[PDB]
Write a structure and sequence with these properties.
The structure is cut from a larger assembly and holds 2 copies of chain A, 1 copy of chain B (211 residues), 1 copy of chain C (215 residues) and 3 copies of chain E (176 residues). With 111 residues, chain A is of the alpha+beta class. Chain A contains 2 helices and 7 strands; from the N terminus they run E-E-E-E-E-E-H-E-H. Chain A has a two-stranded antiparallel sheet with strand order 2-3. A two-stranded parallel sheet of chain A has the order 6-7. The longest helix of chain A is centred in the C-terminal third of the chain and has 8 residues, at 101-108. Chain B folds into 2 domains: 1-110, Sandwich (Immunoglobulin-like), CATH 2.60.40; 111-211, Immunoglobulins (Immunoglobulin-like, Sandwich), CATH 2.60.40.10. Chain C is elongated, with a radius of gyration of 22 Å. Chain C is 0% helix and 51% strand. Chain C has no helices and 19 strands. Chain C is mostly beta strands. In chain C, strands 2, 4, 5, 6, 9, 10 and 11 form a 7-stranded mixed sheet that branches. In chain C, strands 12, 13, 15, 16 and 17 form a 5-stranded antiparallel sheet that branches. Chain C has a 4-stranded antiparallel sheet with strand order 1-3-8-7, with no helix packed on it. The longest helix of chain E has 52 residues, at 75-126. Chain E has helices at 38-58, 75-126, 146-153, 159-175, and strands at residues 22-28, 31-36, 130-132, 137-140. Helix content of chain E is 56%, strand content 11%. In chain E, helix 1 (38-58) packs antiparallel against helix 2. With 176 residues, chain E is mainly alpha-helical. Chain E has 4 helices and 4 strands, in the order ββααββαα. Classes of the chains: A alpha+beta (111), B mainly beta (211), C mainly beta (215), E mainly alpha (176). At the B-C interface, strand 4, strand 7, strand 8, strand 11 and strand 16 of B face strand 5, strand 10, strand 12, strand 13 and strand 17 of C. The complex binds 2-acetamido-2-deoxy-beta-D-glucopyranose (5 copies). One 2-acetamido-2-deoxy-beta-D-glucopyranose binds at residues 25-26 of chain A. It is classed as viral protein/immune system. The entry lists the keywords neutralizing antibodies, antibody affinity, antigens, epitopes, glycosylation, hemagglutinin glycoproteins, immunoglobulin Fab fragments, VIRAL PROTEIN-IMMUNE SYSTEM complex. The entry is titled "Crystal Structure of Fab CR9114 in Complex with a H5N1 influenza virus hemagglutinin". Chains A, D are Hemagglutinin HA1. Organism of A, D: Influenza A virus.
Chain lengths: 111, 211, 215, 46, 176, 176, 176
């Protein structure tokens, strides 16, 4: 007559989450942990409560020399970071050059 | 519920006190019991686990046991600091969830009675001008922590606008309460005397104000 | 030694949702179950459910199934409880507590400090404050009327007078508003000399009132 | 936000992100990956 | 898997085992049911918890790109800057993707090892007081009530207590 | 090796087993011969194929040196450029050599694991219907013709079918 | 550990075993004592020796920081230089810390594997001439004097020599 039994076994569930290993791909597992953030909010925000200086159509040169199209920036409050467009239209209105400009922009990166 | 405990137990310093916990087959019957101690306004503390096991930080005067579908917590040598609420708990295999008893309040006997100090403030002039009137009755320094409050209009009992707080424990381990009487400035003028009556263990403390 | 630190008190209107956090500091709790247990005023402990985030388990009490969501962020060592469709039956202190191991059977040995959630349809309203006018010693105070929600802070003489001060717990009226009284006991000789002012601060309405209390 | 990138801000406790390399603030670490998932549980077969 | 247990000699997992990663199912006169092995479960959780932390801690100081600007006659240093920043971002992308694939391989084999070792823990307590069925189960040659089953699950099974009952039964069977 | 089979309890490999990496040799009244275990062989091939691909894929974006020139008064940036390019070439040389030694260690143990698990797959089907000889072989207590051998190799061996014949033979032997 | 032997079925180590990492303890009419398994010990030492060398050899060419100076209007290249040097020092710090944690995990499991394989080497020589006790020990069904014990320890145990003595004893026991 059949005897009492004990069996050894392990957890299963209805998970369809998958992970990859070196020898195998798309291995279905009971539980896994995503560690990569892929989302953002698409906006430029205050950084820990401090608003950035957003130069809009002005360059740093336009701001600091005071291109008169840059009057939004005649005095600017404390900022957390500065945002500049790739090719601001309000820059050196009277044409010319600004000596050691990139070095100045580097200094600005710590002010 | 699911687990059932006496609402109250008491003892004197050094006495042995026990607190029972009745369950069913689906919990205490087939699962381990944990006990928790809780002082008012603070989180519970684990006192016993697995029926009879004691965390290293818990005094050895605390012990637990389990028989059948029942459990018991024993406190040998009661100390004053043991006055607290006690909860039993177990997993329940029918509810598939953790369950708790309703709690037992342990009182350590022997603390001296203290009669209530009363202060009664009449409506302020400012408030009358705002067309309201409030009688403020402040009760303090009583023990045990349970009073009842009667308000007297002249000598008649008021049956309206009385709002009284629950008793609360003061820093000095005695209790405080407060009761508020709300009247129209006309009702405040309409009578010659108002009185707050605080009865504490049979004896009644009185104060009175006149408009 | 791990401590569990919960988020602060919440005041919610009926039908809303509340999400309370429990941060494990001084070490992780990710390898343990954490439960959420609530305690309604004057009532006993009641299990809501729990989570054991590496193990991969989330469990719920049948009586809250569907209304509560429990979750965890293993990277910030934080567990959360969100309770939806709030009514006054949910006014309670909510605790998080860690079990002795990865599951919910073991005794809960580390507890958070608790988070009070108060559910009410009352609207935020700053207090109206009235003086309570006064031998050896005298009693004078301030009546702090018809405010919502808790709390109010009361000081005397801009914090300079602390002795003999007794601020009583508020009464909650049937209107849904609170009122409290603060009374100070002082020498009656010191009455036609020292001035007595109570300062009442009610942050939620940004109310700040001083009130002079004269004989 | 506590973490800003030129494309948008990040609110996350993930150790890594793939939004843009040039960030400021308290940010996850940038990688080029489209997917990073750690196993915790067991193989789960049909 | 490397250890031959999960989807190996034990054909599949149990949807019914919810309170542990590894555990037991028993059947005797008193009835049948699941029970977790909480010790091996907790050990494995602790290991995976540490693994996750280790991975994140070691990546805690990695390369942070910084905007730098250059004019039209600094193209060489502009290009060096770009290659340098890209170079580190590729190194760190590789380190993260590779570490995750390597550790994932090890985590799934770790579970298989844990199941195998649990099976052997039971096998070496029972010895010839039970028959190995070949599918992760043992059939006892003696009656094994709930307290006896619990002694197997907690590593206190008392072989001498049952050895004569089992010998009689083994002999009955072997005698035919 | 870690799993104790290859050059372990199985003393050596078979030059005669050409159509699988792991497999069987049988002998019965009908004759003797080799047969591959095609399932474990294919699984292992698939794993090694993926391994090779993984290694190459993860190295697909690594550092590319670019010629840059500097004049005689740009020696500092010339030196920074050289260190930067050399620095990445050393990182990537390390990553490749190390990955190959680590994965080679794992591949040879993977084969050992596969042989061990094949042996156990047979052992747990046969149970006490055969004697373990200790050298990778089993001696049956019942006659096992070619269809029976094939049932062992394909995991469908029917223990109950042969258990009485084996019991009689085990008893004959044990009775002396 | 992954292989279930060290602090597994073998409850603890032996302070008395000083001349090997793995070995045996025997007891017979002649007395009792420890003896190293020198072959498995030496193999493991050789492996760990190579491991240490491999780790150091692969780190032999790693990044060397060099002082470079810049004036007050070369802040951009000064910053690029700092990031570049720091960047490599972080890569190499990661490579060293991670390699050490990974290899440490593998070394402790390697020892566990070696103990398990030693136990199985004895188990598969003895077969049913001895009883497995479940704790790392075997109890012989035949007398096993010092030369016989040495044949077990050196892999030359002669099963046929003792099989009849063991059968008689196994039958005495099984007959009760
Ligand atoms: C998975 O789904 C099946 C139905 O196919 C159900 O029987 C089982 O309980 C589910 N498993 C769990 C753990 O919920
Ligand atoms: C893994 O799954 C994805 C779909 O989510 C698929 O595109 C990819 O081909 C799969 N990989 C392999 C190798 O099966
Ligand atoms: C193990 O199980 C048995 C049940 O038979 C019990 O008596 C014993 O207390 C348990 N021991 C431990 C160490 O948990
Ligand atoms: C396995 O082998 C037996 C030979 O006896 C055969 O009858 C059966 O079809 C085979 N089954 C499978 C699943 O290949
Ligand atoms: C192994 O041990 C036996 C002792 O009985 C001895 O006769 C023999 O020489 C040894 N053989 C080897 C290969 O060391």
């Amino acid at each position: 007559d059949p005897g009492d039994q004990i069996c050894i076994g392990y957890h299963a569930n209805n998970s369809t989450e998958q992970v990859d290993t070196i020898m195998e791909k798309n291995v279905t597992v009971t539980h896994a942990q995503d560690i990569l953030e892929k989302k953002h909010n698409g906006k430029l925000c205050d950084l820990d409560g401090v608003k950035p200086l957003i130069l809009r159509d002005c360059s740093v040169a336009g701001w600091l020399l005071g291109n008169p199209m840059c009057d939004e920036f005649i005095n600017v409050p404390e900022w957390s970071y500065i945002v500049e467009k790739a090719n601001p239209v309000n820059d050196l209105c009277y044409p010319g050059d600004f000596n050691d400009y990139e070095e100045l922009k580097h200094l600005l990166s710590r002010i | 519920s699911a687990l059932t405990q006496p609402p109250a137990v008491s003892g004197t310093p050094g006495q042995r006190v026990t607190i029972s916990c009745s369950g069913s087959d689906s919990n205490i019957g087939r699962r381990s019991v944990n006990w928790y101690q809780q002082f008012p306004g603070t989180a519970p503390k684990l006192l016993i686990y697995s029926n009879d096991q004691r965390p290293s930080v818990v005094p050895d005067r605390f012990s637990g046991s389990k028989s059948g579908t029942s459990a018991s917590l024993a406190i040998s040598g009661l100390q004053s600091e043991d006055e607290a609420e006690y909860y039993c708990a177990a997993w329940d295999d029918s509810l598939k969830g953790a369950v708790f008893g309703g709690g037992t309040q342990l009182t350590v006997l022997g603390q001296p009675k203290a009669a209530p100090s009363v202060t009664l403030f009449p409506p302020s002039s400012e408030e009358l001008q705002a067309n309201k009137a409030t009688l403020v009755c402040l009760i303090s320094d009583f023990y045990p922590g349970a009073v009842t409050v009667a308000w007297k209009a002249d000598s008649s009992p008021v049956k309206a606008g009385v709002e009284t707080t629950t008793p609360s424990k003061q820093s000095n381990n005695k209790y405080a309460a407060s009761s508020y009487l709300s009247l129209t400035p006309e009702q405040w003028k309409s009578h010659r005397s108002y009185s707050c009556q605080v009865t504490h263990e049979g004896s009644t403390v009185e104060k009175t104000v006149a408009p | 030694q791990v401590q569990l630190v919960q988020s602060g008190a919440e005041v919610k209107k009926p039908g809303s949702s509340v999400k309370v956090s429990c941060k494990s500091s001084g070490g992780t709790s990710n390898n343990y179950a954490i439960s959420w247990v609530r305690q309604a005023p004057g009532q006993g402990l009641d299990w809501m459910g729990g989570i054991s985030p590496i193990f991969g388990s989330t469990a719920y009490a049948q009586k809250f199934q569907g209304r509560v969501t429990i979750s965890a962020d293993i990277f910030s060592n934080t567990a959360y409880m969100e309770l939806n469709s709030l009514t006054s039956e949910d006014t309670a202190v909510y605790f998080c507590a860690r079990h002795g191991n990865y599951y919910y059977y073991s005794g809960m040995d580390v507890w958070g400090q608790g988070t009070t959630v108060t559910v009410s349809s009352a609207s935020t309203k700053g207090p109206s404050v009235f003086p309570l006018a006064p031998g050896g010693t005298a009693a004078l105070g301030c009546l702090v009327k018809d405010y919502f929600p808790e709390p109010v802070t009361v000081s005397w003489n801009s914090g300079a007078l602390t002795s003999g001060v007794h601020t009583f717990p508020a009464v909650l009226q049937s209107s849904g508003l609170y009122s409290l009284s603060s009374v100070v006991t002082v020498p009656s000789s010191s009455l036609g000399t020292q001035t007595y002012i109570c300062n009442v601060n009610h942050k939620p309405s940004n109310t700040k009132v001083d009130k002079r209390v004269e004989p | 936000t506590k973490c800003q990138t030129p494309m948008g801000a990040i609110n996350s406790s993930m150790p890594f992100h793939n939004i843009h390399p040039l960030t400021i603030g308290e940010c996850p670490k940038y990688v080029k990956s489209n997917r990073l998932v750690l196993a915790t549980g067991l193989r789960n077969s049909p | 898997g490397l250890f031959g247990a999960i989807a190996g000699f034990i054909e599949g997992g149990w949807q019914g085992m919810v309170d542990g990663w590894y555990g037991y199912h028993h059947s005797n006169e008193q009835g049948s049911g699941y029970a977790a092995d909480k010790e091996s479960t907790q050990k494995a959780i602790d290991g995976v918890t540490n693994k996750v932390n280790s991975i994140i801690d070691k990546m805690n100081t990695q390369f942070e790109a910084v905007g730098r600007e250059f004019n039209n006659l600094e193209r060489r240093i502009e290009n060096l800057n770009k290659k340098m920043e890209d170079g580190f971002l590729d190194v760190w992308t590789y380190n993260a993707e590779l570490l995750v694939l390597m550790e994932n391989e090890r985590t799934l084999d770790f579970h298989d090892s844990n199941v195998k070792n649990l099976y052997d823990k039971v096998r070496l307590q029972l010895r010839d007081n039970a028959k190995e069925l070949g599918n992760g189960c043992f059939e006892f040659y003696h009656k094994c009530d709930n307290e006896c089953m619990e002694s197997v699950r907690n590593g206190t099974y008392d072989y001498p207590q049952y050895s004569e009952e089992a010998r009689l039964k083994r002999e009955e069977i072997s005698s035919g």
